């Protein structure tokens, strides 16, 4: 249940070689200790497998290569001996419990509760497979309505653990059908937090920012993840999607984010970055951005995928504010202000301008950065005709097709 989000994050660092070995070798030592303790040996197999090539070579289940620099991901044969032993002790108890409570009165409810426990034990050792089955039998027979939603969200929890997007999705679909039948505000909050993470892994950040910023204000940690991960993950996705006016309302002037103060290095990193964007400072933005990437995006599994996009967009956003507000700049002044040079600035701009983001040219000859962002009717007419041209084609296909038959 609980140790799944902890293990996963810690396990991810090892894989990544952009983070310093000092952080990785700490992370492994904490989590290897948890792996024997909770019997997370099935998940431990999953980990060395899934990469494959670049870590997960130093094991007894792989032939050793120089590629992996952890040997703290390396099995014991002792581990398997306890694994089985524990598996039997607990599982055997639970079976006896089903066979006892087929006799005793009101077996619909009781038998179901032992099948709820079977999933707990399977969640504990990090085998999602046999858990799927046992929680399915719990859903099927008579229990409380809100408890059916808790049972589904546990299944979905294991899906984040292994990190399959397609499995979590389906589990969350049954939750959102069952969401207003139970009426539960309790598992509706829980739904925003779980469904937060799924949207975070999607490239769509607009739905990620709506759920994750709301979930700050009334946040549930009963069989959920830490507030520390969510306050950071919430800030990231808000920074992108919200514009300056709403940035102020919902991030900076958020009382909840304020109260959490600087107590995690991650939190400190993203907090810096939004303020300096807001108050129009440029000198300090350039080194802040680098730190945010190093300490926040990477350790996170789900923002590893959106790491590159963050860097591009972030530069694009700070440029946008500057380009709007000015007709002309110098290449000199712009470069110096962000805190780079003339040679460096010319490259940064050669990425985003040919993609048509900033709508600007640089006079190399003169030494200026000229601005030519259209805000006129011509810009507007172009947007309009793109909507009608997708219509004209879609009429032509639907119209013709019916004409034949």
């Amino acid at each position: 249940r609980v140790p799944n989000y902890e293990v996963s994050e810690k396990a991810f660092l090892l894989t990544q070689s952009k983070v310093s070995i000092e952080q990785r070798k700490e992370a492994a030592e904490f989590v290897l200790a948890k792996i024997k303790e909770e019997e997370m040996a099935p998940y431990y197999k999953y980990l060395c497998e899934e990469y494959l090539v670049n870590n997960g070579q130093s094991d007894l289940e792989h032939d050793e290569k120089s590629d992996s620099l952890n040997e703290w991901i390396k099995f014991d044969q002792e581990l398997y001996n306890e694994l089985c032993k524990k598996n039997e002790s607990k599982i055997k108890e639970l079976n006896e419990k089903i066979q006892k409570l087929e006799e005793d009165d009101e077996g619909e409810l009781e038998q179901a509760q032992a099948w709820i426990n079977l999933g707990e034990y399977y969640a504990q050792i990090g085998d999602k497979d046999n858990a799927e089955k046992t929680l399915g039998k719990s859903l099927s027979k008579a229990i409380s309505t809100g408890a059916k939603i808790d049972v589904m969200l546990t299944i979905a929890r294991l899906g984040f653990f292994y990190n399959d997007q397609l499995y979590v999705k389906e589990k969350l679909e049954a939750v959102n059908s069952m969401i207003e039948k139970g009426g539960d505000w309790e598992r509706r909050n829980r739904y925003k937090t779980y469904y937060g993470i799924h949207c975070l892994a999607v490239r769509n950040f607009k739905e990620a920012a709506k759920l994750l910023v709301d979930s700050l204000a009334t946040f549930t940690s009963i069989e959920l993840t830490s507030y520390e991960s969510i306050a950071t993950y919430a800030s990231v996705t808000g920074l992108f999607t919200l514009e300056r006016t709403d940035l102020k309302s919902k991030v900076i002037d958020s009382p909840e984010l304020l109260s959490l103060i600087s107590t995690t290095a991650a939190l400190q990193s993203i907090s810096s970055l939004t303020i300096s964007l807001y108050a129009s400072d440029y000198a300090s933005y350039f080194p802040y951005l680098l730190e945010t990437y190093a300490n926040v995006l990477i350790p996170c599994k789900y923002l590893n995928r959106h790491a590159d996009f963050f860097v591009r967009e972030m530069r694009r956003k700070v440029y946008a504010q500057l380009l709007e507000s000015y007709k002309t700049l110098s290449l000199k002044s712009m470069a110096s202000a962000f805190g780079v040079s003339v040679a460096f600035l010319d490259n940064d701009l050669g990425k985003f301008i040919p993609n048509k983001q900033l709508n600007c040219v640089i006079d190399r000859v003169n030494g200026i950065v000229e601005t030519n962002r259209p805000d006129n009717k011509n810009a507007q007419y172009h947007l309009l005709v793109k909507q009608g041209d997708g219509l004209l084609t879609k009429l032509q296909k639907y119209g013709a097709a019916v004409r034949l038959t």
């Binding site: 007709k327 700049l329 200026i368 309009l384 219509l391």
Partner: protein, 54 residues
């Protein structure tokens, strides 16, 4: 300028300020956006009903 109370553009290299206070959209164009958006959806919806022919 981002605060948006006189919103003009500053000339760093020629050292001028020009003030712009003129409208930044026309009303008929904005009401058009809602209109063509809706038709895009509608045609899909028709076809869903009209695929009984197929």
């Amino acid at each position: 300028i981002l605060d948006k109370i006189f919103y003009g553009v500053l000339d760093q290299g020629n050292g001028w300020l020009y003030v712009y206070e003129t409208p930044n959209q026309d009303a008929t164009y904005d009401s058009a956006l809602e209109l063509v958006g809706q038709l895009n959806k509608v045609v899909d919806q028709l076809f869903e009903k009209a695929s009984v022919l197929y």
